[PDB]
Design a binder for this molecule. Structure first.
Ligand SMILES: NC(=O)c1ccc[n+]([C@@H]2O[C@H](COP(=O)([O-])OP(=O)(O)OC[C@H]3O[C@@H](n4cnc5c(N)ncnc54)[C@H](OP(=O)(O)O)[C@@H]3O)[C@@H](O)[C@H]2O)c1
Ligand SMILES: Cc1ccc2[nH]c(C(=O)N3CCC(CCO)CC3)cc2c1
Length: 298
């Protein structure tokens, strides 16, 4: 099941989130991406920052080599890190990701964040670079066939308007990948994006990995919310399946990270049931402006 992007390419609506903290051995990324493909995931989300493009690439290549999937069936996303915003560092950063994953192209290449950082992963230091020139440098990557589609991540409406109003724009972003879950449902930004034929893609849709680095151990646990639990019991699914289903029904493409074999196979059940309009309204009622990640921390 895919959504048609504003450049005519197709994005599967359920994506596999690949970030794991650095204590997790790099071999697990290879193993779990194999299991995600086996389970039916076809959209795989990575980034230069994640230090796993070699192993996620190896997984995709492994499953093409054995005839499980064709390259054209996989939608692979990477992201341009903030130390590479300067327009001349963009095409080289993408070629580096392609070398690492040994792929010929990415289906999607994102500006990871609107912040720019001193060229060199977090030097300790910022750097004024015009996100609109960072964008023309992405656009060429699409012209060059190295990214089928281009988009952004962690942009608000103003920062999207900066690219959409750019004089001489050739390619709109196809998406804006942002934190998005029932405690922070982004309903205004989503309406804006819909009006511009920009797909919102939700990350931390399951409430985040609650990593000590960024997540206050006191903060509410999304998947223990009594609404998502009441809906889980009502449908005989799980709160994580209700959280994912919610996004699919409001026209959001959703990511789901899991490094656990049963949970990876469970997540693909999101396509087996639907939420009623009253169910959707109850989840809508959860909105509380809770950010599990704050780029101001990292
Ligand atoms: N663009 C950015 O700036 C940005 C920022 C954050 C995230 N992302 C992307 O989005 C992905 C997902 O967000 P995230 O990593 O914060 O994780 P998440 O998808 O919000 O998942 C949170 C946790 O849910 C657990 N989980 C998964 N399926 C479950 C199920 N059926 N039942 C119960 N628990 C379940 C996972 O633990 P287990 O592994 O133990 O199953 C996981 O650690 C990332 O991996 C990354 O690819 C991007
Ligand atoms: C300045 C800035 C902006 C956007 C950013 N995005 C990420 C990112 O992608 N990661 C850190 C959060 C992790 C959450 C796991 O639950 C997943 C990976 C780091 C980062 C840093």
């Amino acid at each position: 099941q895919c959504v048609k992007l504003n450049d005519g390419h197709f994005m599967p609506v359920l994506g596999f989130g690949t970030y794991a903290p650095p204590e997790v051995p790099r071999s697990k990324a290879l193993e779990v991406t194999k299991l995600a493909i086996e389970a039916g995931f076809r959209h795989i989300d990575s980034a230069h920052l994640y230090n796993n493009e070699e192993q996620v690439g190896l997984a995709i290549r492994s499953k093409i080599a054995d005839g499980s999937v064709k390259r054209e069936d996989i939608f692979y996303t990477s992201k341009l890190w903030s130390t590479f915003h300067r327009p001349e560092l963009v095409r080289p950063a993408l070629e580096n990701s392609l070398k690492k994953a040994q792929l010929d192209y990415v289906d999607l290449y994102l500006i990871h964040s609107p912040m720019s950082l001193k060229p060199g992963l977090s030097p300790t230091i910022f750097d004024i670079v015009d996100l609109c020139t960072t964008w023309e440098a992405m656009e060429k990557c699409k012209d060059a066939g190295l990214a089928k589609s281009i988009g952004v991540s962690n942009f608000n409406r103003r920062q999207l308007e900066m690219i959409l109003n750019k004089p001489g724009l050739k390619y709109k972003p196809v998406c804006n990948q942002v934190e998005c879950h029932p405690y922070f449902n982004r309903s205004k930004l989503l309406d804006f994006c819909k009006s511009k034929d920009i797909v919102l893609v939700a990350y931390s849709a399951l409430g985040s990995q609650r990593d000590k680095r960024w997540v206050d151990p006191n903060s509410p646990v999304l998947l223990e919310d009594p609404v998502l639990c009441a809906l889980a019991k009502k449908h005989k699914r799980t709160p994580a399946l209700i959280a994912l289903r919610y996004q699919l029904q409001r026209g959001v493409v959703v990511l789901a990270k899991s490094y656990n074999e049963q949970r990876i196979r469970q997540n693909v059940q999101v396509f087996e049931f639907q939420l009623t309009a009253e169910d959707m309204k109850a989840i809508d009622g959860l909105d509380r402006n809770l950010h599990y990640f704050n780029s101001d921390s990292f």
